Write an enzyme that holds these catalytic residues in place. Structure first.
Site, PDB file in Angstrom:
ATOM      1  N   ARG A 193       0.788  -1.249   0.000  1.00 17.99           N
ATOM      2  CA  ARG A 193       0.000   0.000   0.000  1.00 17.99           C
ATOM      3  C   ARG A 193       0.821   1.302   0.000  1.00 17.99           C
ATOM      4  O   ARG A 193       0.355   2.325   0.508  1.00 17.99           O
ATOM      5  CB  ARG A 193      -1.048   0.023   1.127  1.00 17.99           C
ATOM      6  CG  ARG A 193      -2.081  -1.057   1.009  1.00 17.99           C
ATOM      7  CD  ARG A 193      -3.470  -0.651   1.539  1.00 17.99           C
ATOM      8  NE  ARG A 193      -3.520  -0.493   2.993  1.00 17.99           N
ATOM      9  CZ  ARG A 193      -4.149  -1.324   3.830  1.00 17.99           C
ATOM     10  NH1 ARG A 193      -4.788  -2.403   3.365  1.00 17.99           N
ATOM     11  NH2 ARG A 193      -4.133  -1.073   5.142  1.00 17.99           N
ATOM     12  N   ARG A 213      -3.942   5.992   1.192  1.00 16.87           N
ATOM     13  CA  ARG A 213      -4.558   7.206   1.758  1.00 16.87           C
ATOM     14  C   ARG A 213      -3.665   8.041   2.683  1.00 16.87           C
ATOM     15  O   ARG A 213      -3.962   9.225   2.919  1.00 16.87           O
ATOM     16  CB  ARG A 213      -5.893   6.876   2.440  1.00 16.87           C
ATOM     17  CG  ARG A 213      -6.981   6.333   1.489  1.00 16.87           C
ATOM     18  CD  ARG A 213      -8.410   6.796   1.819  1.00 16.87           C
ATOM     19  NE  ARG A 213      -9.040   6.066   2.925  1.00 16.87           N
ATOM     20  CZ  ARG A 213      -9.105   6.494   4.194  1.00 16.87           C
ATOM     21  NH1 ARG A 213      -8.565   7.665   4.557  1.00 16.87           N
ATOM     22  NH2 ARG A 213      -9.711   5.739   5.108  1.00 16.87           N
ATOM     23  N   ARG A 251      -7.707  10.623  -5.939  1.00 17.56           N
ATOM     24  CA  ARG A 251      -8.810   9.659  -5.815  1.00 17.56           C
ATOM     25  C   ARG A 251     -10.179  10.348  -5.772  1.00 17.56           C
ATOM     26  O   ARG A 251     -11.200   9.731  -6.094  1.00 17.56           O
ATOM     27  CB  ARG A 251      -8.614   8.765  -4.579  1.00 17.56           C
ATOM     28  CG  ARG A 251      -9.161   7.352  -4.717  1.00 17.56           C
ATOM     29  CD  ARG A 251      -8.744   6.668  -5.998  1.00 17.56           C
ATOM     30  NE  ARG A 251      -8.981   5.231  -5.981  1.00 17.56           N
ATOM     31  CZ  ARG A 251      -9.049   4.472  -7.074  1.00 17.56           C
ATOM     32  NH1 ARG A 251      -8.919   5.009  -8.285  1.00 17.56           N
ATOM     33  NH2 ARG A 251      -9.259   3.169  -6.962  1.00 17.56           N
ATOM     34  N   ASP A 296      -6.971  -2.945  -7.113  1.00 25.06           N
ATOM     35  CA  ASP A 296      -7.559  -3.572  -5.931  1.00 25.06           C
ATOM     36  C   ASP A 296      -7.713  -5.045  -6.223  1.00 25.06           C
ATOM     37  O   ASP A 296      -7.921  -5.405  -7.383  1.00 25.06           O
ATOM     38  CB  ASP A 296      -8.914  -2.961  -5.605  1.00 25.06           C
ATOM     39  CG  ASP A 296      -9.309  -3.176  -4.150  1.00 25.06           C
ATOM     40  OD1 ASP A 296      -9.673  -2.173  -3.469  1.00 25.06           O
ATOM     41  OD2 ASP A 296      -9.273  -4.301  -3.593  1.00 25.06           O
ATOM     42  N   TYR A 333     -13.995 -12.735   0.297  1.00 24.69           N
ATOM     43  CA  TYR A 333     -14.659 -11.471  -0.049  1.00 24.69           C
ATOM     44  C   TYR A 333     -15.985 -11.692  -0.777  1.00 24.69           C
ATOM     45  O   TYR A 333     -16.979 -11.039  -0.455  1.00 24.69           O
ATOM     46  CB  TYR A 333     -13.739 -10.570  -0.863  1.00 24.69           C
ATOM     47  CG  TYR A 333     -12.690  -9.918  -0.005  1.00 24.69           C
ATOM     48  CD1 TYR A 333     -11.377 -10.368  -0.014  1.00 24.69           C
ATOM     49  CD2 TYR A 333     -13.016  -8.858   0.840  1.00 24.69           C
ATOM     50  CE1 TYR A 333     -10.402  -9.761   0.789  1.00 24.69           C
ATOM     51  CE2 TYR A 333     -12.053  -8.257   1.643  1.00 24.69           C
ATOM     52  CZ  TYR A 333     -10.754  -8.718   1.607  1.00 24.69           C
ATOM     53  OH  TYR A 333      -9.805  -8.137   2.411  1.00 24.69           O
TER      54      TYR A 333
END
EC number: 4.1.1.37
Lengths: 356, 356
Positions: A27, A31, A40, A76, A154
């Site tokens: 990552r 963020r 984003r 992702d 998921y």
């Protein structure tokens, strides 16, 4: 493609000696970077993802800040289930999610034939080619995808879970349908990963983030065989296409019980979380594979000086051979970029110092 | 108190040979029982908890269904932080939670002196005495509490978490205040646990459910010392009070890295999750301690026949000596009581069979 200038990461991955320990962060495009949020905000996640230029820009951002020894394509792991025909909604601040998760065997009917997934994911390939061109050989580019069992969790859970009770319920109650789902995922990942390489990826990482919910027995039945199939088939297909295989990394979060097997699963590199002691992981894996990891990301909450000392001890434990430094998990969105910088600098400085 | 009739669990806990493997289940008093929900509807959790008769009834319910070799007092690990002065709200179906978690060092000021916690928890002691009387020596009664680090995670996070980022942020950013908080928790647990024994508990379990978020280094600094202090001081205080020490169990969920140390921490029994292989846990712990565990609770989603086979393999791996059968985590509220029964029956039947 431009000729690679710094290939330390690849050499370390193939097991060769290097002048320093190469470092990258899971990552690194995330963020925690102010510029990441700005970019984003162009729309909302999966709707900004569709643009090759956008994903390229996000990929490059961390490299402008820190002398990282690799870039990883910004994507992702949920793009594969999405390309298989599941709808994702992007909850405001709550993350990507399946509002209609798979719940019974019949739900498998909604999925596309895995053979068409690569063509659905063209935008990802375009973002890889572009990024590879724009990096102009500065450092290697890593492609990636989620591992079959992780992708299954998921799809069945709908998103995050602390027990994976619904997913493991499938393993115990619906073993045949689980195997069918896991084969579909495998059959989709192989062409996706080959496509990433064809498009310019110079290494591949398979993320088995939800390994640790399985014990040894479920893991050997339902996760391992497909982890092995992905590497085997990716390699075969690349050879046949006249292309050079790339170093492949299996990351199994919370997978201490599997490490010994994971070293025999056909991957150059085994990525580790922070809960395994480096010297103990070295025992489990042997001399034949490179380890990657494994700093507690939360350690970056400490002072730069403390980060320095924690990195030194980590490096001492791993030793200089067959090692790529990384965190044990992705950076959290509340981390200080200066502390990320401290981590990168300390890997470089201490690994050179250790060598002397 | 009535004289114990079946003491298999205690003998196994102290390391002695028995005629069969004793079995109990974490959360045996839980939502998976229809009668549990009915009784809990008397009001809402912590408001039904306050009644000794209610907690007694919940404790006994599973024993009416299955020939379990121990009862565990029905309580919650959150009663200690609550007794320390934190307010809990009971979200409808979402679980017990701190709406005002601890967020900075100053928040420690809200807490009661740990020395007064036992007196706040009188109702728990009353529920233990009552339960011990009502069981009339059928099987032993286990008291329990959350381990200091685990209790800290709840107090800081406010509830559940997948990263424990806020809690671990305290460990790295506020190490002194963390040590102070962990000492307060320790200082409260010791009198609470001694009180449980004085009130009639015949064994104690310390639950370190959130161990696995720490790696070896954080765990050795911030979890282990207090796990050791609890056992040391509980034993000392009981000896001084003229009472017999009871077998003590440390359960460290996701604590494979700590097992070797946990065997030296002053506990008769180390409880294990399902992610450690029984034979490998036996290596880590040695011959001096009893192991407890470790069936994947989700295995109970399988057929009774499958549960039977899974229990047989588990028992074969543990061997007949120094072993208490249990799950690796609590029962989920969607489990079939008949499958719980299948698990209990199969432990008994296969352990006798293995002995022959």
């Amino acid at each position: 493609f431009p000729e690679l200038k710094n290939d330390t990461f690849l050499r370390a991955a193939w097991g060769e000696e290097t002048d320093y320990t190469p470092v990258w962060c899971m990552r690194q495009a995330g963020r925690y970077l102010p510029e990441f949020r700005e970019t984003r905000a162009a729309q909302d996640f999966f709707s900004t993802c569709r643009s090759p230029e956008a994903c390229c820009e996000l990929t490059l951002q961390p490299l402008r800040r820190f002398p990282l020894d690799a870039a990883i394509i910004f994507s992702d792991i949920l793009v594969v289930p999405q390309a298989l025909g599941m709808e994702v909604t992007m909850v405001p601040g709550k993350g990507p999610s399946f509002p209609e998760p798979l719940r019974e065997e019949q739900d498998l009917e909604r999925l596309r034939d895995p053979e068409v997934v690569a063509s659905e994911l063209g935008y990802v390939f375009q973002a890889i080619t572009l990024t590879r061109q724009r990096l102009a050989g500065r450092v290697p580019l890593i492609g990636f995808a989620g591992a079959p069992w992780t992708l299954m969790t998921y799809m069945v859970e709908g998103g995050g879970s602390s027990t994976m009770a619904q997913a493991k319920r499938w393993l115990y109650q619906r073993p045949q349908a689980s195997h069918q789902l896991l084969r579909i995922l495998t059959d989709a990942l192989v062409p996706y990963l080959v496509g990433q390489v064809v498009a310019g990826a110079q290494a591949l990482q398979l993320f088995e983030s939800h390994a640790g919910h399985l014990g040894p027995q479920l893991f050997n039945k339902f996760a391992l065989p497909y982890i092995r199939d992905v590497a085997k088939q990716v390699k075969a297909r690349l050879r046949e296409a006249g292309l050079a295989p790339v170093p492949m990394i299996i990351f199994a979060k919370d997978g201490h019980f599997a490490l010994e097997e994971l070293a025999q699963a056909g991957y150059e590199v085994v990525g580790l979380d922070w809960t395994v002691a480096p010297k103990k992981a070295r025992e489990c894996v042997g001399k034949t594979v490179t380890l990657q990891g494994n700093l507690d990301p939360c350690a970056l909450y400490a002072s730069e000086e403390e980060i320095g000392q924690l990195v030194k001890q980590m490096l001492d434990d791993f030793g200089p051979h067959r090692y790529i430094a990384n965190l044990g998990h992705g950076l959290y969105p509340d981390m200080d970029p200066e502390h990320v910088g401290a981590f990168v600098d300390a890997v470089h400085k201490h690994s050179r110092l250790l060598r002397q």
